[PDB]
Enzyme design. Structure first.
Site, PDB file in Angstrom:
ATOM      1  N   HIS C  40       0.813  -1.212   0.000  1.00 45.85           N
ATOM      2  CA  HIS C  40       0.000   0.000   0.000  1.00 45.85           C
ATOM      3  C   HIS C  40       0.849   1.265   0.000  1.00 45.85           C
ATOM      4  CE1 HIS C  40       0.779  -0.956   4.243  1.00 45.85           C
ATOM      5  NE2 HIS C  40       0.757   0.351   4.428  1.00 45.85           N
ATOM      6  N   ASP C  62       1.316  -9.039   2.051  1.00 44.14           N
ATOM      7  CA  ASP C  62       1.269  -7.583   1.875  1.00 44.14           C
ATOM      8  C   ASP C  62       2.665  -6.992   1.675  1.00 44.14           C
ATOM      9  OD1 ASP C  62       0.194  -5.087   1.590  1.00 44.14           O
ATOM     10  OD2 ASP C  62      -0.596  -4.914   3.625  1.00 44.14           O
ATOM     11  N   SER C 114       5.471   2.529   8.114  1.00 47.50           N
ATOM     12  CA  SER C 114       5.297   1.230   7.478  1.00 47.50           C
ATOM     13  C   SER C 114       6.653   0.696   7.061  1.00 47.50           C
ATOM     14  CB  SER C 114       4.374   1.323   6.261  1.00 47.50           C
ATOM     15  OG  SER C 114       3.062   1.670   6.648  1.00 47.50           O
TER      16      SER C 114
END
Lengths: 49, 48, 163, 163
Positions: C40, C62, C114
């Site tokens: 993302h 992910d 992140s």
């Protein structure tokens, strides 16, 4: 009558062509199997580090 | 025509599910920083 | 305090932020000779060596992940399967590990957080932060990690936010 | 510098340079009662007794093993298989052994220093250096060694250059 190809091959000579030509294939496949088992066992031995 | 369509759909859907299962097996071993694939799964799912 | 400074010394060398147009969206980690990047997060890795490498994707966990060049392989992080309960380190202070859940006291953890590698009491990476949720007065995290067998394990609490 | 004195004082009796036109290309090692010599090193053994031998080839492991006469079987290296993680004592200082790989800090390692043994803190050979590749700030090594089963194992990293 008509002379077929492979008409007079005389089962004795079928046995001599089956053994001295098919048996050599048996020799080469058991040699190839033995070589494969040896390669896998050497790699298993060198899995130890 | 319907036999060819059912055959094509079945082969394509089975190949799609096989690729999904191969990715789902090989993925937790390719993400590690060493990528030490165990030997039996490398023989089965055609790994490195 | 003291714990965060050696983590800054480690992150200055091997943790690389991503370059969105004006800000930082996420952090690429280089651990064990395999570059890791969250999905993302979108942008460009700061190194021109790490930018050109095409990444393979793992949508269940992910994370994009490519292989690091041979010169960079010695200058990577280290990873550990064994984690006992207690306290581990992180760029924003400390992180608690309890019942298999990396939790952080609240007020910290937002967008642009992140891929930060959770370190340990030695300097080895045990987890990679991908986001979290505010569990009352203390936030928990949604990390990927490793186990004894060599299997990448992702834990994610209820209704987490992709940071 | 104290460990390098031990390595030099153990190599002064049991290590022989392989000289071609006077230039050093490699080192024969007398460990455990059997002469060892790598393939790609060209030249002759400095010792006159060892040069007049019939070294049986073994092209896979990059070695040319021989046998030692009975009057010389006590003047050999001792060796072992036992190798916990940590540091070992090479000819040029120390060498790290982590995750089953011998790594030296960079700069050192060129054409000629192959066949040198790696010692431990007791004085036993655990590896024989053949070649290595420079992984940036640290050079991995391609050595042969042994194990607990009694099997000679060669480790080889990617793209190693023969020294």
């Amino acid at each position: 009558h008509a002379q077929t190809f492979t008409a007079a091959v005389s089962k004795t000579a079928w046995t001599w062509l089956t053994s001295l030509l098919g048996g050599s294939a048996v020799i080469i496949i058991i040699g190839l199997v033995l070589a494969t088992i040896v390669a896998m066992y050497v790699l298993t031995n060198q899995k130890h580090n | 025509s319907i036999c060819a369509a059912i055959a094509t759909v079945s082969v394509a859907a089975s190949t799609w599910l096989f690729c999904r299962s191969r990715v789902a097996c090989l993925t937790p071993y390719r993400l590690t920083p060493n990528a030490r694939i165990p030997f039996c799964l490398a023989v089965l799912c055609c790994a490195r | 305090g003291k714990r965060q400074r050696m983590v800054m010394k480690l992150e200055s060398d091997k943790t690389f932020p991503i370059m969105l147009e004006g800000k930082i969206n996420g952090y690429a980690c280089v651990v064990g000779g395999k570059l890791f990047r969250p999905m993302h997060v979108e942008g460009k890795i700061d190194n021109d060596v790490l930018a050109a490498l095409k990444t393979k994707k793992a949508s269940k966990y992910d994370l994009e992940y490519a292989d690091v060049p041979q010169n960079m392989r010695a200058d990577t992080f280290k990873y550990t399967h064994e984690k006992p309960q207690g306290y581990y380190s992180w760029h924003h202070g400390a992180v608690q590990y309890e019942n298999g859940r990396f939790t952080v006291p609240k007020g910290v953890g937002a967008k642009g957080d992140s891929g930060r590698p959770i370190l340990d009491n030695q300097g080895r990476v045990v987890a990679i932060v991908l986001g979290g949720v505010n569990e009352g007065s203390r936030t928990a995290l949604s990390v990927v990690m490793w186990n004894e067998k060599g299997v990448t394990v992702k834990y994610t609490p209820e209704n987490c936010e992709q940071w």
